[PDB]
Amino acid sequence: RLTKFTDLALRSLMRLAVVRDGDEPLATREVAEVVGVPYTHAAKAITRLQHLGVVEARLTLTDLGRRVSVGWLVRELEGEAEVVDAEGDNPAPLRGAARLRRALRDAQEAFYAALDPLTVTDLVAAP
Amino acid sequence: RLTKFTDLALRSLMRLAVVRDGDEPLATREVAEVVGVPYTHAAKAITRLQHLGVVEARLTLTDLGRRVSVGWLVRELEGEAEVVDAEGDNPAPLRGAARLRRALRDAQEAFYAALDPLTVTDLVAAP
């Protein structure tokens, strides 16, 4: 599974990918409603997506916002979760623990490897 | 990342892999201490590992307990977590949501694909 935040940001920019013509006014209120979350979590996602340069804030996607690999975007959004959340793991000494930790980091990289090929435009497509 | 339970069971049978000679008496009390968790969670892991046939309970590993693929074992331990935990996800309608859900299930399968090659004996090894 993923991160609740990583999820949130993905859904958010995925929704901002949707409208491309003069469809409507969309800001943090509109998208906080749309993806179905409080405004407090959606400001966090919108801003961390502005700091990663996908959202230009006057809200729309940037060209960066559309051509970016999702596996990398997930790495960047979920890596901070790997920092904050995994600091309170503190597991005990077990024989072979680090050899597993190696394997788990690898399988995670395969998870990310399957998501590196695709963009947000691939997510919200229409053949 | 993984499941707290999946983790727990892995560490448990990994510890039961350790002693193979007449080293000591090991039961659910000993291993609940060893991997550093309450007895209440460790009985759940020990039993779900007996129902998956890796632990013979008179506690040791079975031959099944040693030659099993970990990617499959994780699939089986974390799949029930995919049932219980993901029932309370209930996400809202988003354009392209199911195409993502496809991708996320795939990347997960790549995560598991990297863990399918290895056993518990590979985890607790010694070249």
Residue numbers in the entry:
A (entry chain A), B (entry chain A): 2 to 59, 66 to 134
Which sentences from the paper describe this structure?
We also present the structure of a three-Cys-to-Ala (3CA) apo ScNsrR variant at 3.9 Å resolution. In spite of these limitations and because there were five ScNsrR monomers per asymmetric unit, we were able to solve its structure thereby gaining precious information about cluster-dependent DNA-binding modulation. Indeed, a comparison of the structures of wild-type holo and 3CA apo-ScNsrR shows that the [4Fe–4S] cluster conditions the conformation of two relevant regions. One of them is the C93EGDNPC99 sequence that forms a well-defined turn in the holo structure, but is less ordered in the apo structure where it adopts a different conformation; based on the superposition of the holo structure with that of the apo-IscR-DNA complex, the tip of this turn should contact the DNA backbone of the ScNsrR-binding site. In the apo structure this interaction is no longer possible. The disruption of the Asn97-Gly37 and Arg12-Val36 H-bonds in apo-ScNsrR, indicated by the different conformation of the main chain in the medium-resolution apo structure, results in the displacement of the RH by over 2 Å, which may be enough to prevent its binding to DNA, as observed. The 3CA-ScNsrR apo structure shows that the conformation of the C93EGDNPC99 loop depends on the presence or absence of the Fe–S cluster.
The most widespread dedicated NO sensor regulator in bacteria is NsrR, a member of the Rrf2 superfamily of homodimeric transcriptional regulators. NsrR proteins from Bacillus subtilis (Bs) and Streptomyces coelicolor (Sc) have been shown to bind a [4Fe–4S] cluster, which functions as the NO sensing module. In ScNsrR, reaction with NO was shown to result in loss of the iron–sulfur (Fe–S) cluster and formation of iron-nitrosyl species. This process led to loss of high affinity DNA-binding and activation of genes that were previously repressed by [4Fe–4S] (holo-)ScNsrR, including those encoding Hmp-type NO detoxifying enzymes.
